[PDB]
Symmetry: D2
Subunit: 289 residues, 4 copies
């Protein structure tokens, strides 16, 4: 099991640390524009493997990602349109190299805006869409389930609620079909306040410590684990749906997206989702050139 990580900054290094702690890969290759920083991270992370699984951890060039089972893209530049433009250029260059050196790999994109950049990866690489996913709303869906579980006295495993759409303050909860232990959620255990807290927490973290990285590192490691272990767990990654990438329920196994799950939405949820899609489609048009 070989995993390469493109962009060894705060998110890339934290995710490598979590993958080491999960003991699921044999080799991690770290790539960065800053060659010294990647070499320093690789050596520090190698030291951490001492307490877990024997692994190869090394900095490399793009040729060193050849044969990777999975490639994580965690690169990014130091207005929202300004960020999308800057990162689209970065992701295009990364994607041309993955296509060249790892034509058969599976790509998970984290770079923001995650849904837009995931589509860029898919288009530039030419891969099948099932082999290109973004982390979408995976973290927020998991957090919403944990908080509902806590508030209603039940394991999050029994809380079946999805957050879908464009990752960020315009994502939406699919309340109408949410359930706990197979009964409607409203008839089991206000819930809107919890979703609001989840949706906005990322802005608060960035506001206070400058960036966010431990949450996404853990969500990404969970997703990677279901690929490596061929679990078929249902996530809400960024996935191809109707000519855009958007957060949406999907079964993930060793081949990537096995299928999407077409959940039912009421009128208001349908409207928010189509509005989420429209916003994504316009950012894509902007970076078309």
């Amino acid at each position: 099991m070989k995993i390469s990580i493109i962009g060894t900054g705060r998110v890339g290094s934290s995710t490598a640390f979590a993958l080491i702690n999960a003991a699921v890969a044999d080799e991690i290759v770290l790539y960065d524009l800053n060659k010294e920083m990647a070499e320093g991270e690789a050596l520090d992370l190698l030291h951490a493997t001492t307490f877990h699984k024997r692994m190869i951890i090394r900095a490399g060039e793009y040729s060193d990602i050849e044969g990777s089972d999975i490639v994580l893209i965690t690169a990014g530049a130091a207005t929202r349109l300004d960020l999308t433009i800057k990162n689209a250029k970065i992701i295009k260059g990364i994607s041309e190299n993955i296509k060249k050196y790892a034509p058969n790999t599976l790509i998970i994109n984290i770079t923001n805006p995650v849904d837009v950049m995931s589509y860029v990866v898919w288009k530039v690489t030419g891969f099948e869409s099932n082999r290109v996913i973004g982390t979408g709303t995976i973290l927020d869906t998991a957090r919403l389930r944990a908080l509902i579980g806590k508030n209603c006295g039940v394991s999050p495993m029994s809380v079946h609620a999805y957050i879908i759409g464009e990752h960020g303050d315009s994502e939406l909860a699919a309340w109408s079909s949410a359930m706990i232990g197979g009964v409607p959620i409203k008839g089991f255990c206000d819930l809107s306040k919890i979703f609001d807290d989840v949706k906005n927490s990322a802005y608060t973290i960035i506001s206070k410590k400058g960036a966010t990285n431990y949450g996404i590192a853990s969500a990404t490691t969970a997703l990677v684990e279901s690929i490596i272990k061929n679990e078929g767990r249902v996530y809400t990654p960024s996935v191809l749906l109707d000519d855009v990438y958007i957060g949406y329920p999907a079964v993930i196994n060793k081949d990537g997206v096995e299928r999407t799950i077409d959940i039912t939405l009421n009128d208001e949820e349908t409207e928010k989702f189509e509005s989420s899609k429209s916003i994504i489609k316009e950012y894509l048009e902007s970076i078309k050139n």
Copy 2:
């Protein structure tokens, strides 16, 4: 964390081995009418802890179950069903009177068959609160149904939300009308009836081939115990009090035992079958009432 096991036969010793392998308890006390067998099992199981967790494993008398956090009842023999119900109810009555005396604050998990009827006997004889007395019910069969459905439909069993309920055994039923996969009705996601029949009948096949069954229930019991010890609030289908009988039914399990039941909707067919199960159990209870 102290667990006592009453009846150190095939199931009792297999469950002790699984709990050791799970590394969730500090002390296991083993009880049996056959004193030397319990001592031999305890020594052998102590050897196994070498590779897992430092623990106390010992055979003991009822005074040694004092202060147990959990007591498992795996006693009795595995003949008509009424004859078995009568014989095991007498065994379970005596065990229950001793747990009442020596571990009045504990939580009891009953495995002895027929598991729903015997769980009710435990509850009545100990005088415990019903949340502190449960049987293993349909937990194994529900878990197997979700695994097989997930295999057949290409999804994790964590995403298959289907329950087997009712009287453990040939009378149990799958709550198909409310089953779902990933928050979509099961029909529209993916044959189900054949998978259920395979699950429901497998215990008979195992028993006919190797004489008894023990590894499946040992693993299911260990999972239930982990949810109590870890205060997880996971949903199981144990034997739980539902109005005026113990029966397999969805329930939230945490450190205090049964937190609540989950009232699922059943269609007309399923309601008829569940009521048939409840009737069978209640008539067994009425038949052994004079023994309680």
Copy 3:
């Protein structure tokens, strides 16, 4: 990772259960003379996998052990010479089938007397000795370390003491070179009583519950884990030493016995070890024919 188990009695089924609980193999094939009993065990054990790792668990014929990475021999008949004669016939037949259907596998023998039967396996299969081991004194060495650790207030990981020789009441502790955290054991923390208790405990278990199986199942699973994970852990299996199989320190990795460790013994330990060897060599002469 495919493991086959020959003899699905108390030890065979307990070991399969422990291997399932350890989640290290993808497939276990169970063989027994009693075909119904093997099928019943396989189905019960399959049910246990539900709570652990997805696995194939099945009863099979000898052709079904083809391709096994590891084969465990846990078969045996229902005086000591009488048992050795009875089990030697059993092990010869099993070994001829392993040679035929799994020529490239690694064999771990548990059938008693474990040191004698391990040699029979080696000779009949024609395998390289590094690919044939018995469980030797692994359990008793582990127990001695746990009890010393408990009595002296230290982790068993830091207790370096070996039990060697013929498994049973004539095995011996290599006290003169034992140590705790790299100082002589006598100068760290009577120890003879602990060893005596360890050596004799198996007779007591058999005496009280008719047989023993959970201890050896756990020791065998530990040994299998160091092979599968290529750990290079030091055990005291039955290994080829000077034209006999005998319990002795050895490094175990994915290829089996990587090497033995030639520890130093004082005069009395040397005498006991050579006496242990002589006893084994005479049982081998007896079943030569």
Copy 4:
């Protein structure tokens, strides 16, 4: 199980993440002079617990470390060594006075550099028993040496019994004369000196390349904490009191902290080097005595 972390910088937050991933604590309290940064780290780390263990993670003031089972000190800046010793001793004195006041019964693990000197300052200022104050010493370097030796000689690191001791850094030494593999002197089992030099110098290389080091010490600290929480009695080389200085040295670690040291024999060369290390530490202590 409650752990407080004083100094939520690169090392403090990385160690919190590793402790979360290890699932050994129920509550982590994070303290920092930079209040908003600590709050942001706590929120981000709370998100990570979603995938591991239900926990409380929160930023707090010193009153919030009351009742902590363990307090980790990861504060200070990473200039001469004497200037750093002076500046960090003042930081550590203030932290130690606050832990003394709000968590007088706790166990302290110091990471702040220079780790041996600072650990002694913690011990002196808190007035704690020495078994309850330890530094991370040479724990990481010892673990790395055993891993690399095992790789080179084809054996598990569990079978390599070698210690790095002395002052953490360029002054530390390997106790080669008593090192062993599988109960045989290391020379006769399997170049060692080059492996040690690689270990001893790697921190400098990491720091020059990525500016700081944090993942290795976070993992080593988490292993040490697990041995305390699990009452394991594993042997480490933390910074521990050895007569009248704190220095890296073999020690048995259990739920009470340092159970005992292990007096290994050193040859003449190693004794000279260890005495040189002790001298360096003691003269730093004498130099900052007026600050204590």
